[PDB]
Amino acid sequence: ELPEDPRWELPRDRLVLGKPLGEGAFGQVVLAEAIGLDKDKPNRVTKVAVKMLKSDATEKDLSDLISEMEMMKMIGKHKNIINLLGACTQDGPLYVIVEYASKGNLREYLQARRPPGEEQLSSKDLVSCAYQVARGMEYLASKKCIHRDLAARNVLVTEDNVMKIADFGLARIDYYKKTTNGRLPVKWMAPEALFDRIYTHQSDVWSFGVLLWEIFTLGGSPYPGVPVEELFKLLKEGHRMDKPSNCTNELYMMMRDCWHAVPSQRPTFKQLVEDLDRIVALTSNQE
Numbered sequence: 001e002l003p004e005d006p007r008w009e010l011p012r013d014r015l016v017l018g019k020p021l022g023e024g025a026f027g028q029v030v031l032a033e034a035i036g037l038d039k040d041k042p043n044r045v046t047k048v049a050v051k052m053l054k055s056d057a058t059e060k061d062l063s064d065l066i067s068e069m070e071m072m073k074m075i076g077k078h079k080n081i082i083n084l085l086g087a088c089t090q091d092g093p094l095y096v097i098v099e100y101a102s103k104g105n106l107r108e109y110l111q112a113r114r115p116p117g118e119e120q121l122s123s124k125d126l127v128s129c130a131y132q133v134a135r136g137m138e139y140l141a142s143k144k145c146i147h148r149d150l151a152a153r154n155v156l157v158t159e160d161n162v163m164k165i166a167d168f169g170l171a172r173i174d175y176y177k178k179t180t181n182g183r184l185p186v187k188w189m190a191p192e193a194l195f196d197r198i199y200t201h202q203s204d205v206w207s208f209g210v211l212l213w214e215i216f217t218l219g220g221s222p223y224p225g226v227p228v229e230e231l232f233k234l235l236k237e238g239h240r241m242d243k244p245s246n247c248t249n250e251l252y253m254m255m256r257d258c259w260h261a262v263p264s265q266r267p268t269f270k271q272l273v274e275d276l277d278r279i280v281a282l283t284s285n286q287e
């Protein structure tokens with residue numbers, strides 16, 4: 001049995017469950033329609049994403065779902081994060097109701113827009129995407145949240161092309177474990193986070209640098225064919241990824257600054273938001 005929180009509770013007859021969303025990257029998530037989430041009006045439907053537990057769910061799987069919801073309540077609202085919209089906690093399974101992003105993850109969204117062998121993104125659209133992700137991250141940081149897994153796969157894209165950071169309310173690692181696409185999350189990890197288990201806003205700044213690299217290569221894979229052990233060796237040697245093609249030196253120096261050996265010397269998300277805001281303004285939409 002769960003305690004009823006009336007700030008968030010939505011009656012069960014007000015949620016129409018639909019087809020599963022994606023390849024279960026964020027757990028068991030379905031598309032749904034919520035009848036009257038707002039008082040004006042109780043007659044409007046909103047497409048929402050609903051997270052619930054699987055059939056083979058443990059008492060720990062339920063505890064994590066609750067913590068994530070409670071965490072989302074505490075963080076508050078921001079344009080550039082997946083927002084909590086409601087929950088079904090009484091007389092049945094737990095349903096955590098969050099914002100729906102119809103264009104999928106930033107890696108997919110970017111990949112579908114790569115020039116041929118939907119539509120192409122200009123040089124400004126790419127800088128705008130980065131600006132939005134740094135904006136989202138800055139909010140979470142201001143609310144004391146450390147993501148730990150910032151990647152393009154954890155950035156969802158809405159129908160209106162808004163960048164929304166996902167999987168920010170979770171708190172946990174197997175270095176050899178792969179993602180859905182067959183990629184290794186250790187590749188986005190700061191060395192101090194990787195070797196010393198030291199997680200900070202600074203280790204998230206490292207990850208943002210890899211995320212910018214993902215935007216500028218239009219969904220490129222970091223370190224292809226590089227196993228865990230060889231990656232360790234690259235980081236220890238001070239190796240850094242090469243400058244993507246059709247990337248300015250100003251933006252490559254931002255990735256580099258993000259990947260500073262010394263965590264204190266990296267820019268903050270507050271600083272990144274300022275720099276990217278200025279760069280968006282000066283970036284051409286003509287190419």
Ligand SMILES: COc1cc(CCc2cc(NC(=O)c3ccc(N4C[C@@H](C)N[C@@H](C)C4)cc3)[nH]n2)cc(OC)c1
Nearest residue numbers: 021022026049051082099100101102103104166167168
């Ligand atoms: C903390 O934050 C989170 C995030 C979530 C996820 C919520 C969510 C998921 C989605 N959306 C998709 O999962 C999705 C949708 C479309 C996709 N694509 C597939 C692709 C092939 N074609 C594209 C044209 C569309 C690919 C993926 N919205 N909200 C749940 C959560 O619970 C508490 C907390």
